[model samples]
Target: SHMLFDFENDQVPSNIHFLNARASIETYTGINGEPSKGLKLAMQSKQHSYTGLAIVPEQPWDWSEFTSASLYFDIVSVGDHSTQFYLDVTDQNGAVFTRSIDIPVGKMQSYYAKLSGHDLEVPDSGDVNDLNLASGLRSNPPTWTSDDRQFVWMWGVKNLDLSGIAKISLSVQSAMHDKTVIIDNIRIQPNPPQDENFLVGLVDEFGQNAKVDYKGKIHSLEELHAARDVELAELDGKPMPSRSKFGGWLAGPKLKATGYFRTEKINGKWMLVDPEGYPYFATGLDIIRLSNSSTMTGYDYDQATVAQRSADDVTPEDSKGLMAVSEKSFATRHLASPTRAAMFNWLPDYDHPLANHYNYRRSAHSGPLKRGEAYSFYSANLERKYGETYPGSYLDKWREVTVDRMLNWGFTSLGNWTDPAYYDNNRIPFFANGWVIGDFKTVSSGADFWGAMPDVFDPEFKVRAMETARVVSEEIKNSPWCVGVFIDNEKSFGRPDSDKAQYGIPIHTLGRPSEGVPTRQAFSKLLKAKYKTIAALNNAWGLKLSSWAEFDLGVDVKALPVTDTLRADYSMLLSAYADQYFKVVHGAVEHYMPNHLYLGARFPDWGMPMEVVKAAAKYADVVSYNSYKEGLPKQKWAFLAELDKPSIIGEFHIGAMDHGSYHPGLIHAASQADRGEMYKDYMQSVIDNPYFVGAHWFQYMDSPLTGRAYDGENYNVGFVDVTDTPYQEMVDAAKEVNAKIYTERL
Candidate 1:
């Protein structure tokens, strides 16, 4: 370890500075609980805000060596609450590589963040290992890919220039109330700390966490089977007695029986009327497929270039953290990502019966690898718990049990991304869903977190839309239980931060290449139709374009100065784009599934604009959004009352690290108990809203501790864990809420 800072020398370097923080050199308990003098940074904010400790060098320090390396430091959140900060490493040229560190309050944890080497002759961008570089706000999951044996707390950073280091910034991400952190023994080293044993068999046979033990964790096949029997006995193969066959408020407001699910405005309140005309709200869970039950195994074809053959070989937007693996490309496979591969404590042998649960993902949402092998510990656990000796396939039993549990918990519908098996149980209602993924051209709305918006005018796009709707219609077939069809997840329409981003649909669309990108062409066509020619449009928008031909060629609108003329035109274009998207989706769904409601593509709270909402309401049977925070953003969504369309939250959840999981999800809770309270608060807020007909939890099961294979999301957002044991607090909260929703809403 090369000591990078001599705190005692020059009293912690005269250049070391603090902003919105109180700092001092003090004896602090650090690595191995040894008392040592280190920098203590104390920050307190009346409201949530940022604070930091920055040490910018007068003369840029040279770290030409240890190009591919890590920065090591022992630190503790000395405050009463967990604190977070981004470690921004700045090159001499002002380019930055940001890494995040989240330290739990009061624990002295060893921390390290990777800074990969970059090779460059002139340009700043280097041939760095992109997998090693940090990209987004993905902070380290405690001892996740990195081993606990070395540095228990580890993270990653973006690219950096190694020739000259200009600054090291401990920028606070958020200091909610009062947050303090003490840093000790700052050092730099070549290569990341590793232990082969760390990645080797970190998971127990039952797919439980090898290091941590929590409540209701499965110990053996006997215990697992016993728990299964107990739940079966609890469900007793019955629906909730109060619900009409469609899982509605059976006793409340008996209206005209439509013999199908339909939205009704009865007595000044919006509701889903069942086939039996009972008032209904879709209390539900999402991602009900076996997909979330599994994660990538970090194994891929040993030496094969990712080739196009299988449809699954392409990258998917929603990988859930599995590595995209192409086994057909090569005869041999090996553990490719040791960081990911070594995360498990146990894996079924390649030729073993448990290996049957192994799956290969060709595309991943996010990860180091494009494709890799995956495993389903949940499925394996189920087979072991109720294996061959059982009268029925445990796989079948899984659906049965899920249905029974939904009914037992009083969830009215199985939400989006549900498995087909659960759809036909005829016991509970469900939402039929499908993604419109194909070779559709796309246009960006500035912040395409999931992916760029589909080129709605594209012929392939419409064809795919119709095909998706056709499949949905076939699967549902006018099923009385299916509430509606959701034909995509969140579409990144716009972001919440700035007006420039909010109106990015037009800003980006107008600036795109004229040919091939159908959305751009469509937008241009609209502008041409509106103003007839470039001069007239320029006069209207105060621009000086040479001709319509030049605009058609692609004008960089973002570079142009901001103006109301541009803003008004951008806003109008954004609305038209939104309208086109929803119109296409609506026409397809209405064409195939004429009777069922066409729930709009689930809008994310952050990425929705008023234009998108207005358009969604115009065409969609119901406006849907995924609001993951405490509740819907009231400031942003206050217009729903005016839009007057029934709304449903497609996804929302609260999670905590209490149960051996790393991430607490988007909405955090201090503990499992706190999760219940936060959930109730969130649900209550939704219930109080007159526009909302229902809200569905994001997932049924917790993501694997390591993360899902498509994206590395290891959040504790499930009502049930890997072993299928329900979080009693969450279950209780659901039961408590569902029990009295009708009366409470009224």
Candidate 2:
């Protein structure tokens, strides 16, 4: 272990500085219940916002010398409530790598964040070994008693620059209250080679030496197609297992439906019934798109030729958007700048049938690609795997095979983000989703991690909602194959805690001037009606104001005391705002597609507010969650049983480092086989729970090995690898779980 900061002779550990936002860290003598030789560092957040200490080295440290590493620390929280802590490392050039974890109240615990291999340059540097190390770190689960907190680990970090790390900062935050945390034993340590290869033999079909195609080695196109044919022939053109009207087992108890999908509570558990009156459990996969296999465009492209191609493009507006990106933009710099060399040994010629596979994006949501050139390796691989047909009909065959796989795989419905190409097939039910992206008045919840929050109070929001619904309805039509519609993905509705920016919506609303933003105006109206006078408002929120007019300027309020009357006001405001958001979306959806269910905005765990959930319950047919935890998030979602609204696990997946991707995904598993077991476990947990109607794996195919055009995710989270081959382990597990799904629920 390389001791980065030792407080033994302490006075503020060397090279460390405070980022005080009503927060302070000081050196103390108490050591885990004893006054000892080594010093203790205490962190107290006076305000519940993000604040902490920065470990700024005298000079940037060159961590590139080590093959693998992690920052080690001992941490303990003082408050009754758990709070989130963040550790971020910044490179000299401003590239950042961050990880956040929850600190349970009680005794000290050890935690580490795995470093990213994205920028590593070595033999298989950003390869399976990198991913395996991360998976092992996160799988080292906690075993703590009341006297001690359990160990926690975070993985899949991004944009790590070990060559010149400028600084590392540690911060803690909560929304409604302040917190105190104790820390010690700060160091940087080399990861054990054994830990890195912990999953080496765990999976029967994957590892550092796995001999699968798509690694740009080992098999000719003839051999690949031959193998695919052999595998397909065994399953294709065969009779699928008998299924219920909803594609679930005909054995489950029958339920009534209106010839369209709807949610109902049978006995006590939630279930989705199909149009023909059969209980349906949506064992589904999402983002079943042919274009998912795209990586950033290379810098070596002939600029003149690309520019000419850009000029002749029919989607000129899209190109204009890309061109608008300044060189200073991170996307421009990151995407246009080359990182790793292209992974594929073959990309079809520009005039070839596979040439149409290339695409571009102005910005990627999860990655840095402001103006990116993209290619779908999967599309090219398909052309190579199966010989090209006239005008490239191979993709059509790919779709047919995919749908066949779904039915044979026992997936009753297609999950959110399923492509339209598969929609008209009518072989499997699917959920339609669309984004409300337009020039709408938006505001940030101090923690707008995804983006800005729409001002629900704004009239434009209603207009946009209606327009989005109208467009979606035209695409979905009165299709009985459609289960429902999710109007948007995860919206940053803000959490209720003061320590996190998750609840930034209300925080930002209160701090914005009441003149322009509709939410801010609505907040003022709520405050005025509640307090009646400026002095009253000031007293409730622990502030001093001269006049009601001055209140229009907005005030920055920190974490309100638990007993503060303002806490109730804040909740009320959030509830009202959330109510408006859902009412407008629900109303628009109802007007456009009255027969289909209105699935609520898929909320990620980071930003689901109770107020928003309650509001969604009042309108949405089924509340949805993009839950990516190891098992049921019992504590975070226990409210579902109480809400009594049918809910769906809209998205979740367990990815492993077994594949060649650099990332192990949001929820890491030790191996491909373990990924399968965890999938079974998570689904079983959802099935046992009464409020869940269904659970959907994130997508049908893996993201590009290089990264998707929308974001450089490059995660091993797909059911199929980049080569369009299904993961046999995941498939077998899905079959086993789906086989007993209906009966197990009963």
Candidate 3:
């Protein structure tokens, strides 16, 4: 709120200016006290590679009365490699806009610069207008950026002149390396007043905002099924910390494995034992599913059009099939529109029992539904609090209250796309997942959003990875509570250092067509066995080809300057196309579950790639990783100590916005008791990192306060609360990170 430059006046703010970098004005010794000067920089990128520091405000600082301009800062990381920063600015038509900044290794962060909404760009220094450095940072553009679209890209703008403000840098284009960082308190405040009754006092009493309280906006349905049976008998008397037999942690450290869920290395860390051998950790929860409740119902609701709306005074039988009820009329049709279609006070009767919770989704995975229709106000508030004992048995009492709320909220495993009706619910531990999609032979890297890139040297991708591992080992058979299987989820497989390897599949198989692709004939036979001809593979890829018959007639290279032997030949052809996609999906999950665990294929530090973690640690037996940042990602993965394997994570979450849900995911927190103290400080930095053995929580409800049917992801990432309640401060930070997992891993 104040200190927009707390360099504590040791001076050097001669209206700052170092632009093409090389700074100095240090001090450092305070979070609120001692010494504390600021602005260190020292970046020096030889030859216009755009270094930073800038500021320039002695006369241009208008900020039209601030609605956005945060930047608080503190970033130490004194080089040993790892820096990619950027922040730029410039308004008043002086162009420039950038954004991508991340300076960890000594932390203190805030970051922002909106001047009016949208702001998501960051693809190659966020392109203030692309100047080719690899097609201007890989020309990415998915959606959300319209308020009159006035440029300064990434999440689009509308009226950003912020009354002048001509400069505001922080850059680092990285060239002869040298990078060093440490900038502080460079604020720009004013944008606070947004609480609009913090989602109407975060509803609960079951109109769901979730931190549990139950029975709200009530009157009767037998006092909301008697306050849902006294909060299901106070969540079946809490109790649940003591595991193993795949739930691991029966007071940790006692590994020898072979009782079931394997992967050891014990005393040297890298665990996951629990067959009985204890020492496991995977604190789970993910897509614990009911197909992410539902949204995008036969749309077209009077004129908002991002999916379907058209309102001109509301009609179509007063917005038949609800939601955005065509922007409402007939006296705002039954009021309440707070987090998208408020969880119904009643819309039942279409053959009630909450009409067996209805369902239908044709295409959405991010709005624009070509076909839709869905309903499930959390399965009609679990059929008005479990009132269907025999009529479609309230989804078997929602699979016995989701395995007694994942064992009274201590969660051991159900991670990856769960829901095979909680797979033989022998009380927890799951994973079994699928998806290998059809019409195979694809390839794209150009960041194929969520498709293309499956011609893992085709053969119809080993017949769709052996029919998706024989339908996930025919629904997990040899189960020791099946802790494996996750064939696919988040698979773009292309980033190894920006411009996301021009969309990854070995730079889109060079230029494809090498004898009708088999990953472009195995990347032209691995560059003809490491440059045997074609003039030693066009002189180590700086290319100028002329022979090897025009390199088998196909070559589309762009954004070249990637030297370092073309990034070690695109990490040896992306580790031979992720080692033929983890050896044909680990030889079709060892030809049908050779004792589960194939895991892998999660990898998403935004398009992973250390040759897809050395080809998923030679065929993944656990090398997942979804990690939506914040705390321990071991300083952005030091290749799990050079691929000594045994990683998990498979997705993470924090989310907040006092729950009237509107995308508070991808790590964010500002209360739901500060998203359960940032989920116990991101699970105590994954219980003091040791090449992590587990960490799930990517969901278990809370999406579709108008969004999900396949992706309008209305996040508040969830541990319930779409009516199926839960969220008592994220189940008390998942029961204090599941009772301090084996006493912080012994």
Candidate 4:
């Protein structure tokens, strides 16, 4: 009878057997003849490690005369989603024979291991490691194995009796619950030399490097901020460039680690600063679309908030309705849903939500932030950065204003995402920014974007990234208004919930017939390679495959529960994606703008994950983020502090129902006066967060009645009206506030 070892339910401690010590081993049959749905035989699930058996046997084997062994398997883990396949053969006496196979996540697949008579397992201890036949374990039957989680079953074997004369007996090399293998379709056939390179000349194989130096590394935020001041001093007073050359010129400062802005303790309070240690107050207008510069005139009643009564006027409608006193606050929890915990370190629990990162209290001049005590929204995600697709003109107008209006308004410099043209305006210090884009060689995508992704796995991605930064740096280099360079924007990596967010096997990446995106082809290849055993995949994923060959031809695999294995694969894949994204952007920036500091792509305090943050910490000089909150929370700041890198507040702004714009009417504040009150409170909260360096008001002008072309978002929170008139009271607040910005205590 064939040997059967069930590793399920075995008590196993998690130290050395598997990486995470969470999953154990299970066995399955009929898995190697074709692709089965990816089903794990066992799991060794945990935060760190996993191991499995992948068995493949040769047909027409006469063991006595045969000389070798062959096998294939895939590896998914923490950093880059990649796979490894191997074929090993030992001699009758258990001496060693070797071969290895390396597989890229997708498009690159297949591997083989060849062995000689000296290569076959000569069992001594009856284990895989046992080298002599005297141990009664002469050969290892190829099988599928894993520690803990789901896996796509693939075809594998243990060819015994290649020559039909050599006797063989078998047992699993290890029996610990965490590291067992799934045995499948056994074959005894002729052994032949097999090619082990699955990545030969496939796609443009470029070395995917992780993290590029952005002016080396900084141990503290203070150091980064200093670098920026020096860079800014050197470029003071130059005329800014035009918008078209903005991105390319941005590449230069992006290579250096300039702490353009900083937020830290002065006496007792937190404040934003210039590169020098001196505290700097930001007296600026709150604009709707920061990139939009040209102003329009005339009030449009169609705008909801504008047509609506002022919040201060308090119409009968202002009365709290019955639902306002509803008993329930939050929805029910689900095991499968993404759960967000409260952050209490920013302030006392009585002041804000559970997961808040900022302190939220009333300011000396500004009123209290607690109106029933709730935050505006969850944390900001990646769309805050790279996702912005806008026109060039929107950015151009801002540059014209930076030199004229900003200095006139008593502001020290242009904030995050300021006009690239202003990079040369030494008369005013400003930060430059860039976007890294391309067709990714191998990437994982979903509704979310994590850290900046580098498509280094694809060579073209690198070329495009370098070229883009080169262009930006040459345009803005040596300009004084340029304090530091911000690269890219808020990006999403992956969420901890669902398979789509985890494994990232989106149809776009799958190459399904229905997906229609060119990227689908690679996805199809991945499905074939992972689930080599057709039948086994059918069982796990609940789909049927006609044959191994047909499986790669784009047959639809059932969308099943996303297993932990897939998530691991997806994370590794994304790490590769980000690692590539960061390197390419860094290389380009350093190549072009080496003299300036390289601030990170301003991260959204919301959507970024720990892994992405850790990855970015290795590359950026001073990490930057765009946070729009009433105050800074402790837990979030704690994370930033751990990075030990100076950070900048790239963007933040508050809007209210003034000027009667967007009147469909869900105004939070009562009137323009109330709106002004709210804005001050928001600004003070930002100033109080020690981790914050500098914050730029989101916009300079209010939104027009008709929205901009790219997206249909209409808001009216600018420092000025559509007519370029400043809100007088708001300007006064800035004057009073700016004067004493640095002289406060917590």
Candidate 5:
């Protein structure tokens, strides 16, 4: 091993440069409770600061002879909350690659960093995501459980040219608070052979952690059916006695009977008025479908012959056809990766009895292969669980079972991205949702993580919105059971970053081809209306443009230096862009489903800026956001409350490692018991807030053991595991929340 720094002398190393804080060598507790000397980096309380450092070597290091290099270190977080630690490695060509993880604070962790930055290329300057030059990017697996290694951070970059390595930087990004981190034993060494450290068959037949044994681990069909029977006996298909037929508060004062779900201010709190005119607070689950359970099954088809879907498509075409069932053209099939195939203990042939669970993904966001065959272990487990007793289809039985479980658990509604099978089941209030998809003209806000923002001014976009709402209306048939219609999920209008990224959409739009791009033309018209003449615009905008026509041809606003006048204009343009999108979707929803509430697109806290939320409030009956914090603090939410409009949390969840999962979703919890406590606490915060109406858990099932095929999001964010067994801790806490929520809200 190449020893970089050991900190044995109790002195700060010269190579380490603290970017935003001071550091010193201090005595700290080691992984085994032994006294050890390490670099103690102290980060002071700051609003939003990059608190970390860069470890620049005295000279460029060369590792051209080795296929890969491994970085080993021991770090401990001394923060009150979890901190997502990010690392970036740069090569001589200025190409960069990155990886990040939410570290467990107050505990020591040993990790090895696999540098992945050799394949990054300079992106096109005119492209929407131009600034994000780091390529081959993906998150490293959060935690690893082995006798040898505790954690492994990945950089998906392959065969990086290490002839001349530049520097390695680390930091706690995005979130900022007073914290301290201890670093020790930094070492870099040549990685072992490909299969030397990889364990074969890590996933069992039942889609569980093969090495770990825990509660609700299914070893046989008898155990699966036994658990199912036990759950059915507990759930008698009846909700709480305190709730009315529509799952409204029977203990509270009765309000106006609208005969349809609507939002209203009761006394002072914003709430959803039930069909029977009683106050309702929606507690629900998102992605309550069998579809998201699919995992890559180490098989692929030739894309050259068969048409493949786009990598970023929300729902692929193959996912809707017979290929999604059991039909596979095996003539063109091949093994995508031997490493991925080795993870499974057993896999059924294409002609097996449960082969219907096997499906194909034409493309994926991340995994071994972009296109491959996928298997639904959750589906196979269901078949194994209830083969003989189930009269209807397994999926049909699952739908019925879920309806009973939701009500018995005291959830008033079903959240966004639910299956169509649950839409008409009046037992639970369905939160209908639809995405606006098409080849609509788009521009980037520079932070379009999902995709570019649709040019709402485009004529085709309005038509697509109308079509989307019309299809939803036909399915819903104006049902009173649906609480509201959430139009989309997490539109990346803008993100909080540098000035270049903050105004990315406007900057990019201004530089786009004006004649073909609707957004460019609309922005130009707005600017023309404001300034009236080219000379007037030039003086105030800090530009010496030749003419108004020249601006339309292409101004390259990204190249222009940022100014106060420019910032104000960019802010207004972003607001206008958001306003147009909300207006179009709101109008469509109101026209087709007049009785139902028009819930705004589920805005995540990171991407939705203040200007976008203001636009949302104007048209949406109730604004929606996917806040993934542990709890909502009053002081932090005070700004949103000032709007005085009703808001609902479209998605939120807490996950943990003790529940047989490698990852703990987006938000972390210590254990299953803590997840329950944190869940109840989060719901309580929503209940106490007057401006908030509801909060929904993001999912119903934990992601597949090997990660979902769509995006490799193998998170433990479900009420139930792959075997359809509920976490008793979560179930117990949810019951308490539903039973006392109405009374507590008052």
Candidate 6:
């Protein structure tokens, strides 16, 4: 549609109908009211209220259809637990047929209509099959047990049985007390015919590539190792070895270093206490919005600009709070100042010539950190200001500032995912990081942001463990500022851990030879070694398999369910992954930064499996996690208490559309003020958990223009804007709590 009557400040679309009148408009992406062409939506919010969409079908259609009906939708974040999306299908006579899809808040995902019923005009016993209305291409089956009542809405798809129904109005609504969903172009259509393409293909891709079909099978570590060996041989000597831990797993260091090193018992839990035997508290921030770079050459504005444009491509409602950052703020806030080009060619003319603010009382801001550059902006700024970057007194100044800031603001220590460059400064505690990558056997995977895995079964993974640990140890030395090492970020350690998730393994089900299936081959070997007879295997799982080989060669792990069995099998895999990951990093921490704590993986609440957490608990001095939600109920906190281990909240955040920004629905805080409030609620919850030691904010500064990436997230959840002004509420809130926080009882 042409902008026939363009809005001077910001304009709403002509065809668009907004249910909530309080919705605001701004021209962050385009002219006054409309978002740029790539994004289009009339965004609104509820102050603990409810909102939704309505589409009236003008023409009358048949009352009965051959198969099914569904609604296509996109859901957004609500409050702690708010109704996300609801589908109400009514006929001409106002006979209402309603269903709600309760997508979790902070989870913006796609859904296919799965709500199944035979009659939409006359609602069923209100017992729609939960599977039909499930959210995302990957999600747990719905549980509408009449008690939780949380599964009233669905994202992506909310389906219904289309039997004897004509002239219907399909609409999406939310009953959230506080939150909004920017649903667009709701589609209520007939169920598509079964894919002829799949039928003609004959074999799924995994079937074509597997050594065995993975039907209801579990693999042992030994078989997993054997498979890795074969893959290594098949590589014919690639430059980098595989990540799979076949043969013998390499073991990293196993020594505890000097200085304030000792374990202590606290609250009936053995914490890797320091010289003082005190639990370590870790506070951190996330780089979710900032497009990360490990370069020191010239700060490429062109690349950054292009990246910004790509970030702007998410749905317009998602981009509401992320306005276009000025070139100066983008450069100064994102890239370190004093880059080679800036120091010479782009000095005065460059953005934020004085980006390095050195006021001690203010929160510290880092300088640029471009690739191929000798000195990052922060280091250079320190050098120029203090005459030397590493002088004990000068370093102490930086440390003192940080420690005081943290203590003053109620932070326990430095958080996970901060710059490692500051680790040795020893002013306060911080976490370490490593990226585990190698040629390891892998199951098929969905889109996991940090999806790559190092085969823990691989013997070399053990060896690399030592190296990775050594790097962390040497990097931090024995600085008290160092807390523990985090192995990696946002790893997907097998989702749901059930039959559906297992059969959902991306590559194994492609219809390949048993040898082609890594996970399946392991399972086959396990079955043979344990059962010895196909009869036993078949009998145990209630299968129709004539032989173990046939079962091993069949695809699809869903029909039989057996979710518990699948989870148990996947637990072994997760255990192996976690063992290698933790052992090596722990060894490195002890040998190099022994006095410091061995923090657990900065785990994501969604990704960390129970098995992985249990395994890591055995080794890590502290267990760390990253939760983006505002708060988890007190009952959920019991999980940490059960572990009885000192815990740190590595990351958590909330973003809202009120600010001009773009990000995934789960990407934003409710507002700049809400950002601070979320921090308070989340932190207090952490403190209340006796096992919880500390919490950290996820970021220091907002991203430049959008998230500066293509993952469809652009948000402003930072404590400071790109211009360096504290989001006043966040600063005040931090002061309110940090000034009185202590390791004792809350």
Winner by lDDT: 5
- Please give, for residues 566-615, the per-residue lDDT of candidate 1 as tens digits: 87778888888889889999999999988889899898866788888899
**Sorted by lDDT, highest first, which candidate order results?**
5, 1, 2, 3, 6, 4
The regions of model 1 sitting more than 4 angstroms off are 1-200, 302-331, 389-392, 539-544
lDDT of each: 0.72, 0.65, 0.62, 0.38, 0.75, 0.42
Best-to-worst ranking by TM-score? 5, 1, 2, 6, 4, 3
- What is the alpha-carbon lDDT for the whole of candidate 1? 0.72
Compare candidates 4 and 5 on lDDT and give the better one.
Answer: 5
Query: What is the Cα-based lDDT of residue 249 in candidate 3?
Result: 71
RMSD for all candidates, in order, please.
Answer: 6.3, 11.3, 26.3, 27.0, 5.0, 20.2
Query: What TM-score do all the candidates reach, one by one?
Result: 0.78, 0.72, 0.31, 0.44, 0.84, 0.53
lDDT of 6 by residue, 29-136 (tens): 321233422112222332222244444434433434434544444444444533334455554444444444434455344344433432222221122222111111
Tens-place lDDT per residue, model 5, 1-746, is: 78878899877878878876789888888777887899887765243345688988777668665455567778877756554566777777765655554455665766666542222222112233322211111222222333323232233243345776778777754332455788888877665544432335668888888877886788888888889889888877988887887899987688899889888888888988899988999998998877678877777776665655553343433224324543436557788767567768888866777777777776555455566777788888878766745443777778888889889889988888787778889888888877777777777876676666899999988887888888788878898999999887877877775777777889888877689888888888889998899998899777898998888887877877888889988988888888899999999998899999999998887677788899999999999989886566645678876799999999888887776776677666657876887788778878888999899998999988677776667778999998888988889889999888788775
lDDT tens readout by residue for model 2, 1-746:
78765555645555777654332344433435554333233444433244577878888998876556667777666645444566777887876655655554565566665453212222122432132121212222211112332222233335466788888887754222354566677777665443332222221111111322333232455656776877688666322465764585576566675878988877877888888877878888987775555655543332333333332221212212223122233223323443322333454455455566666554444433344566666666677666657666777878788778888888888887776767787778888876665666887777565567788888888887888788778879779899999877777788544533544676677777889889889888888898899888878877888987787887776455444475577688888888988999999999999999999999887678788889999999999988876557445556876789888888888776546654566665546776787688778778888988899998777776555555455567888875667788999999898887888776
Weakest 10 consecutive residues of candidate 4 by summed lDDT: 201-210
Better of 2 and 4 by TM-score: 2
Q: Looking at candidate 2, what is the lDDT of residue 201?
A: 26
